Structure 1
Amino acid sequence: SGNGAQGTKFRISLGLPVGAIMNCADNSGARNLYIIAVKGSGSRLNRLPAASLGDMVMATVKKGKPELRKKVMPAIVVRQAKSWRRRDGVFLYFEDNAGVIANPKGEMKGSAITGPVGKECADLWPRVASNSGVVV
């Protein structure tokens, strides 16, 4: 995350390392996002920088519209599909990995989100919560 964080986030189990391809949930014309970096990740020998729900990543559009391909852009993870624990102790997970496109300040490139988003992401990014249909 980093700059555009609205508050802090509890540790969510990391599910999306570098090289992961997730679905592109918004209506910006991109089909999938390919994660090349995680904002705020630490440094360890041989350890891959991994992303969780609500994290801001750097991503490229591998499949989609040609004006979105072949460049790096920030993205926000909204669906994780690797099970994580909340402080009320429910273990929950979606059925796919999904993110949306944003600028470095966090406002969405698109306008609407298809499918659910996590509340740990909706609380942390208000534009995602603004364009989100259902928040769970």
Structure 2
Amino acid sequence: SGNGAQGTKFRISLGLPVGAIMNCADNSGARNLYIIAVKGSGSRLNRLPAASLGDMVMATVKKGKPELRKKVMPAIVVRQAKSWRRRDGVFLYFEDNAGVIANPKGEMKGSAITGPVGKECADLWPRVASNSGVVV
């Protein structure tokens, strides 16, 4: 998160460390995002920085249009395959890992989101919820 987040996020179980490849959920032209860093992560020896649902990450584009590649850009994780526990008590998990390309402030590069969007990510990023059709 960091800047542009409207509130705090309860801890979601980490499933995406550095080096994970997740799908691209918006129509920015990218096909997948290669996560290289996680914003707001800690500093422990030998521990990889891991991401969760709603976290803001810095990622590159491996497949997609040639003008979106070979450059680092912020991304927001909207789907998670690792099961996490809500405070309601349900253990839920999606079918795959997906993310959307955003600016440092929080505005999305695209305009529409394919597939569902987690409820914790929609509350933290208002503009993600505006472009998301169905939530969980």
Q: Please classify the TM superposition score into its range, dividing by the shorter chain length.
A: over 0.9
CA distance in 1, matches of 2:67, 2:132: 25
Q: Distance in 2 between matches of 1:4 and 1:94?
A: 25
State the match for 1:60 in structure 2: 60
1:4-27 alpha-carbon deviations (Å, 9 max, x no partner)? 111000000000000000000000
Report the Cα offset of residue 78 of structure 1: 0.2
The Cα offsets for residues 69-126 of structure 1, whole Å up to 9 and x where unpaired, read as 0000000000011000000110000000000000000100000000000000000001
CA distance in 2, matches of 1:128, 1:104: 13
In 2, Cα distance between equivalents of 1:79 and 1:36: 17
Aligned to 1:127, the other structure's residue is in SS state helix
Hey, what's the Cα distance between the residues in 2 that align with 1:71 and 1:133? 29
Kindly provide the CA deviation profile for residues 9-60 of structure 1, in whole angstroms up to 9, marking residues without a partner as x: 0000000000000000000000000000000000000000000000000000
Query: How many residue pairs were aligned?
Result: 136
Q: How does 1:92-131 map to 2 (within 5 A)?
A: 92-131=92-131
Percentage identity across paired residues of the two chains: 100
Q: Secondary structure at the match of 2:47?
A: coil
Q: Secondary structure at the match of 1:129?
A: helix
User: Which secondary structure does the structure 1 equivalent of 2:61 belong to?
Assistant: strand
Q: What 5-or-longer segments of structure 2 have no aligned partner?
A: none
- The structural deviation recorded for 1:127 is 0.6
Q: CA RMSD in A?
A: 0.4
Distance 1:106 1:21 in 2: 21
Q: How far apart in 2 are the matches of 1:70 and 1:124? A: 28
